[PDB]
Amino acid sequence: GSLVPELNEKDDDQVQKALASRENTQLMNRDNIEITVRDFKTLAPRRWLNDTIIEFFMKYIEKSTPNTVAFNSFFYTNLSERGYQGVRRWMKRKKTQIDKLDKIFTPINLNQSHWALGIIDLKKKTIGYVDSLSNGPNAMSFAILTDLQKYVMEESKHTIGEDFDLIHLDCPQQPNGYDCGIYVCMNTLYGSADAPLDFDYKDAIRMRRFIAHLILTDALK
Amino acid sequence: PETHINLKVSDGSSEIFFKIKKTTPLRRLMEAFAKRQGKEMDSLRFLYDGIRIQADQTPEDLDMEDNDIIEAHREQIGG
Numbered sequence: 001g002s003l004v005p006e007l008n009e010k011d012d013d014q015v016q017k018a019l020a021s022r023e024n025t026q027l028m029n030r031d032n033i034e035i036t037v038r039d040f041k042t043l044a045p046r047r048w049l050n051d052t053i054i055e056f057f058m059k060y061i062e063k064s065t066p067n068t069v070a071f072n073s074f075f076y077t078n079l080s081e082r083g084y085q086g087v088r089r090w091m092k093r094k095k096t097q098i099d100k101l102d103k104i105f106t107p108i109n110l111n112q113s114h115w116a117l118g119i120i121d122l123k124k125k126t127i128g129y130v131d132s133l134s135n136g137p138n139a140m141s142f143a144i145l146t147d148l149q150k151y152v153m154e155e156s157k158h159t160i161g162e163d164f165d166l167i168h169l170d171c172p173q174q175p176n177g178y179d180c181g182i183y184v185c186m187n188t189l190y191g192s193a194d195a196p197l198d199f200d201y202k203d204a205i206r207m208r209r210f211i212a213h214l215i216l217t218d219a220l221k
Numbered sequence: 222p223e224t225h226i227n228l229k230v231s232d233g234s235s236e237i238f239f240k241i242k243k244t245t246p247l248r249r250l251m252e253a254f255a256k257r258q259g260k261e262m263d264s265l266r267f268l269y270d271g272i273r274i275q276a277d278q279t280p281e282d283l284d285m286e287d288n289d290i291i292e293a294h295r296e297q298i299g300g
Contacts, residue, residue, distance in 0.1 A: 042298070049299070050297065072273065074268055075271060109298075110299065
Protein backbone atom coordinates (compact mmCIF):
# COMPACT_ATOMS: atom_id res chain seq x y z
CA GLY A 1 0.00 0.00 0.00
CA SER A 2 2.04 2.97 1.25
CA LEU A 3 4.04 3.71 4.38
CA VAL A 4 3.06 7.39 4.16
CA PRO A 5 -0.38 7.84 5.70
CA GLU A 6 -3.05 10.35 4.83
CA LEU A 7 -4.02 12.72 7.60
CA ASN A 8 -7.59 12.98 8.83
CA GLU A 9 -9.24 16.37 8.30
CA LYS A 10 -8.69 17.48 11.90
CA ASP A 11 -4.97 16.66 11.80
CA ASP A 12 -4.56 18.36 8.39
CA ASP A 13 -6.21 21.54 9.70
CA GLN A 14 -3.77 21.63 12.61
CA VAL A 15 -0.90 21.52 10.10
CA GLN A 16 -2.48 24.34 8.00
CA LYS A 17 -2.93 26.55 11.11
CA ALA A 18 0.64 26.04 12.26
CA LEU A 19 1.93 26.97 8.75
CA ALA A 20 0.02 30.23 9.02
CA SER A 21 1.15 31.28 12.47
CA ARG A 22 1.98 34.88 12.85
CA GLU A 23 5.48 34.69 14.22
CA ASN A 24 8.50 32.54 14.69
CA THR A 25 7.60 30.64 17.81
CA GLN A 26 8.98 27.35 19.08
CA LEU A 27 6.68 24.50 17.97
CA MET A 28 8.56 21.53 19.40
CA ASN A 29 11.58 20.95 21.62
CA ARG A 30 12.38 17.34 22.37
CA ASP A 31 15.35 14.94 22.13
CA ASN A 32 17.68 17.86 21.36
CA ILE A 33 15.85 19.08 18.27
CA GLU A 34 14.13 22.42 18.55
CA ILE A 35 11.69 23.29 15.73
CA THR A 36 10.46 26.83 15.10
CA VAL A 37 7.75 28.07 12.78
CA ARG A 38 10.48 29.19 10.35
CA ASP A 39 11.71 25.58 10.14
CA PHE A 40 8.17 24.16 9.98
CA LYS A 41 7.25 26.35 7.01
CA THR A 42 9.88 24.53 4.90
CA LEU A 43 7.29 21.70 4.85
CA ALA A 44 4.73 23.97 3.13
CA PRO A 45 3.88 23.00 -0.42
CA ARG A 46 6.72 23.37 -2.94
CA ARG A 47 9.27 24.49 -0.32
CA TRP A 48 12.84 23.31 0.15
CA LEU A 49 13.36 21.43 3.43
CA ASN A 50 16.05 22.74 5.75
CA ASP A 51 18.41 20.82 8.03
CA THR A 52 16.08 21.12 11.04
CA ILE A 53 13.30 19.17 9.36
CA ILE A 54 15.78 16.58 8.01
CA GLU A 55 17.21 16.15 11.54
CA PHE A 56 13.75 15.85 13.08
CA PHE A 57 12.90 13.04 10.64
CA MET A 58 16.18 11.24 11.35
CA LYS A 59 15.29 11.37 15.09
CA TYR A 60 11.82 10.01 14.40
CA ILE A 61 13.29 7.03 12.48
CA GLU A 62 15.78 6.44 15.31
CA LYS A 63 12.94 6.59 17.86
CA SER A 64 10.89 3.94 15.95
CA THR A 65 13.49 1.57 14.57
CA PRO A 66 15.70 -0.80 16.48
CA ASN A 67 19.45 -0.85 16.33
CA THR A 68 19.50 2.22 14.06
CA VAL A 69 21.39 5.51 14.10
CA ALA A 70 20.32 8.32 11.80
CA PHE A 71 22.71 11.24 11.92
CA ASN A 72 21.75 14.83 11.14
CA SER A 73 23.18 16.20 7.88
CA PHE A 74 26.12 17.97 9.59
CA PHE A 75 27.69 14.50 10.11
CA TYR A 76 28.39 14.09 6.39
CA THR A 77 29.53 17.74 6.12
CA ASN A 78 32.16 17.15 8.84
CA LEU A 79 33.21 13.70 7.56
CA SER A 80 33.71 14.99 4.02
CA GLU A 81 35.38 18.29 4.91
CA ARG A 82 37.35 17.24 8.02
CA GLY A 83 37.75 13.48 7.72
CA TYR A 84 36.96 10.84 10.33
CA GLN A 85 38.57 13.12 12.89
CA GLY A 86 35.74 15.57 12.24
CA VAL A 87 33.09 13.04 13.40
CA ARG A 88 35.16 10.80 15.71
CA ARG A 89 33.19 11.80 18.84
CA TRP A 90 29.72 11.64 17.31
CA MET A 91 28.77 7.96 17.80
CA LYS A 92 29.60 8.24 21.52
CA ARG A 93 26.92 10.92 21.83
CA LYS A 94 24.41 8.45 20.31
CA LYS A 95 24.88 6.29 23.44
CA THR A 96 25.79 3.24 21.39
CA GLN A 97 28.59 1.62 19.40
CA ILE A 98 28.86 0.71 15.71
CA ASP A 99 29.02 -3.05 16.45
CA LYS A 100 25.49 -3.02 17.91
CA LEU A 101 23.80 -1.46 14.90
CA ASP A 102 21.86 -2.74 11.92
CA LYS A 103 21.92 0.52 9.92
CA ILE A 104 23.36 4.05 10.01
CA PHE A 105 21.57 6.72 7.92
CA THR A 106 23.46 9.83 6.75
CA PRO A 107 21.40 12.54 4.99
CA ILE A 108 23.64 14.59 2.69
CA ASN A 109 23.35 18.24 1.75
CA LEU A 110 24.89 18.92 -1.66
CA ASN A 111 25.98 22.51 -2.27
CA GLN A 112 23.00 24.10 -0.51
CA SER A 113 20.83 22.99 -3.40
CA HIS A 114 19.99 19.27 -3.10
CA TRP A 115 19.49 16.52 -0.52
CA ALA A 116 20.51 12.85 -0.95
CA LEU A 117 21.08 9.94 1.45
CA GLY A 118 23.71 7.46 2.45
CA ILE A 119 22.64 4.12 3.95
CA ILE A 120 25.26 2.04 5.78
CA ASP A 121 23.73 -1.43 6.20
CA LEU A 122 25.92 -3.22 8.74
CA LYS A 123 23.85 -6.40 8.59
CA LYS A 124 23.96 -6.65 4.78
CA LYS A 125 27.52 -5.32 4.64
CA THR A 126 26.61 -2.69 2.06
CA ILE A 127 27.01 1.07 1.70
CA GLY A 128 24.40 2.68 -0.51
CA TYR A 129 23.94 6.15 -1.99
CA VAL A 130 20.31 6.95 -2.89
CA ASP A 131 19.46 10.13 -4.77
CA SER A 132 16.05 11.16 -6.14
CA LEU A 133 17.50 13.33 -8.94
CA SER A 134 20.32 11.23 -10.33
CA ASN A 135 21.30 10.04 -13.81
CA GLY A 136 23.34 7.31 -12.16
CA PRO A 137 26.65 6.20 -10.77
CA ASN A 138 28.95 9.17 -11.12
CA ALA A 139 32.19 10.32 -9.50
CA MET A 140 30.81 12.56 -6.74
CA SER A 141 28.68 9.62 -5.61
CA PHE A 142 31.89 7.64 -5.35
CA ALA A 143 33.59 10.11 -3.02
CA ILE A 144 30.48 9.87 -0.81
CA LEU A 145 30.50 6.05 -0.80
CA THR A 146 34.22 5.89 0.00
CA ASP A 147 33.80 8.47 2.78
CA LEU A 148 31.08 6.35 4.40
CA GLN A 149 33.22 3.19 3.99
CA LYS A 150 36.09 5.06 5.62
CA TYR A 151 33.82 6.02 8.53
CA VAL A 152 32.82 2.39 9.14
CA MET A 153 36.43 1.18 9.05
CA GLU A 154 37.67 3.89 11.44
CA GLU A 155 34.72 3.91 13.88
CA SER A 156 34.93 0.12 14.19
CA LYS A 157 38.69 0.23 14.82
CA HIS A 158 39.26 -1.64 11.57
CA THR A 159 37.05 -4.59 12.44
CA ILE A 160 34.36 -4.10 9.82
CA GLY A 161 33.75 -2.28 6.55
CA GLU A 162 36.67 -3.12 4.20
CA ASP A 163 34.69 -5.78 2.31
CA PHE A 164 31.41 -3.86 2.08
CA ASP A 165 29.81 -3.51 -1.37
CA LEU A 166 29.49 0.17 -2.41
CA ILE A 167 26.30 0.72 -4.44
CA HIS A 168 24.50 3.60 -6.17
CA LEU A 169 20.96 2.54 -5.19
CA ASP A 170 18.02 3.04 -7.53
CA CYS A 171 14.95 4.91 -6.22
CA PRO A 172 11.81 6.73 -7.46
CA GLN A 173 12.95 10.00 -9.01
CA GLN A 174 11.33 13.34 -8.09
CA PRO A 175 9.30 15.00 -10.87
CA ASN A 176 10.08 18.51 -9.60
CA GLY A 177 12.90 20.58 -8.23
CA TYR A 178 11.83 20.99 -4.58
CA ASP A 179 11.00 17.55 -3.16
CA CYS A 180 14.54 16.21 -2.72
CA GLY A 181 14.44 16.54 1.12
CA ILE A 182 11.03 14.72 1.17
CA TYR A 183 12.48 11.92 -1.03
CA VAL A 184 15.42 11.67 1.46
CA CYS A 185 12.83 11.23 4.26
CA MET A 186 10.84 8.62 2.25
CA ASN A 187 14.10 6.76 1.44
CA THR A 188 15.00 6.72 5.16
CA LEU A 189 11.49 5.59 6.13
CA TYR A 190 11.34 2.80 3.54
CA GLY A 191 15.02 1.80 4.00
CA SER A 192 14.53 1.61 7.83
CA ALA A 193 11.55 -0.71 7.31
CA ASP A 194 13.41 -2.73 4.66
CA ALA A 195 10.55 -1.99 2.23
CA PRO A 196 10.74 -1.92 -1.61
CA LEU A 197 11.19 1.67 -2.84
CA ASP A 198 7.86 2.01 -4.63
CA PHE A 199 6.64 5.34 -3.27
CA ASP A 200 5.80 8.11 -5.71
CA TYR A 201 5.19 11.84 -6.00
CA LYS A 202 1.75 11.60 -4.40
CA ASP A 203 3.41 10.00 -1.39
CA ALA A 204 5.78 13.00 -1.39
CA ILE A 205 2.80 15.39 -1.16
CA ARG A 206 1.41 13.38 1.78
CA MET A 207 4.86 13.10 3.36
CA ARG A 208 5.08 16.84 3.90
CA ARG A 209 1.82 16.77 5.84
CA PHE A 210 2.82 13.58 7.70
CA ILE A 211 6.11 15.04 8.92
CA ALA A 212 4.33 18.27 9.92
CA HIS A 213 1.78 16.19 11.90
CA LEU A 214 4.60 14.29 13.68
CA ILE A 215 6.08 17.62 14.80
CA LEU A 216 2.78 19.07 16.07
CA THR A 217 1.96 15.85 17.91
CA ASP A 218 5.35 15.74 19.65
CA ALA A 219 6.11 12.33 18.14
CA LEU A 220 9.47 11.92 19.90
CA LYS A 221 7.80 11.66 23.35
CA PRO B 222 38.67 23.69 37.08
CA GLU B 223 35.59 23.00 39.16
CA THR B 224 32.57 25.25 38.58
CA HIS B 225 33.82 26.95 35.44
CA ILE B 226 34.62 25.58 32.00
CA ASN B 227 36.72 26.73 29.07
CA LEU B 228 35.01 26.41 25.68
CA LYS B 229 35.92 27.38 22.15
CA VAL B 230 33.34 28.24 19.49
CA SER B 231 34.50 27.86 15.89
CA ASP B 232 32.91 28.30 12.48
CA GLY B 233 36.02 26.88 10.77
CA SER B 234 37.69 30.28 10.30
CA SER B 235 36.71 32.45 13.24
CA GLU B 236 37.22 30.98 16.72
CA ILE B 237 36.30 32.60 20.04
CA PHE B 238 37.32 31.28 23.48
CA PHE B 239 34.97 31.65 26.41
CA LYS B 240 35.07 30.75 30.11
CA ILE B 241 31.65 30.30 31.68
CA LYS B 242 30.08 28.63 34.66
CA LYS B 243 29.03 25.03 33.97
CA THR B 244 25.46 25.94 35.06
CA THR B 245 25.22 29.05 32.84
CA PRO B 246 23.10 28.75 29.69
CA LEU B 247 25.08 28.89 26.44
CA ARG B 248 22.73 31.56 25.02
CA ARG B 249 25.04 34.51 25.76
CA LEU B 250 28.05 32.64 24.38
CA MET B 251 26.18 31.72 21.19
CA GLU B 252 24.79 35.21 20.67
CA ALA B 253 28.27 36.71 21.21
CA PHE B 254 29.73 34.41 18.58
CA ALA B 255 26.97 35.19 16.04
CA LYS B 256 27.16 38.95 16.59
CA ARG B 257 30.90 38.87 15.94
CA GLN B 258 30.26 37.21 12.55
CA GLY B 259 27.43 39.70 11.94
CA LYS B 260 25.13 36.68 11.51
CA GLU B 261 21.65 35.98 12.73
CA MET B 262 21.19 33.29 15.37
CA ASP B 263 18.47 31.45 13.40
CA SER B 264 20.86 30.98 10.48
CA LEU B 265 23.49 29.26 12.62
CA ARG B 266 23.40 25.82 14.23
CA PHE B 267 25.65 25.34 17.26
CA LEU B 268 26.66 21.70 17.67
CA TYR B 269 28.53 19.82 20.35
CA ASP B 270 29.75 16.41 19.17
CA GLY B 271 26.86 16.42 16.69
CA ILE B 272 24.16 17.47 19.18
CA ARG B 273 22.24 20.61 18.20
CA ILE B 274 22.44 22.91 21.21
CA GLN B 275 19.36 24.75 22.32
CA ALA B 276 20.24 28.20 23.72
CA ASP B 277 19.43 27.90 27.43
CA GLN B 278 20.98 24.46 27.69
CA THR B 279 24.12 24.65 29.84
CA PRO B 280 27.49 22.91 29.51
CA GLU B 281 26.43 20.69 32.42
CA ASP B 282 23.25 19.80 30.47
CA LEU B 283 25.39 18.53 27.54
CA ASP B 284 28.14 16.78 29.54
CA MET B 285 30.83 19.16 28.27
CA GLU B 286 34.43 18.98 29.55
CA ASP B 287 37.08 21.67 29.77
CA ASN B 288 38.34 22.93 26.40
CA ASP B 289 35.54 21.29 24.42
CA ILE B 290 34.61 22.80 21.10
CA ILE B 291 31.27 24.03 19.86
CA GLU B 292 30.92 24.09 16.09
CA ALA B 293 28.91 26.87 14.49
CA HIS B 294 27.40 25.66 11.22
CA ARG B 295 25.42 27.50 8.52
CA GLU B 296 21.78 26.37 8.04
CA GLN B 297 21.48 23.94 5.15
CA ILE B 298 18.68 23.94 2.55
CA GLY B 299 18.10 21.88 -0.58
CA GLY B 300 15.64 21.06 -3.32
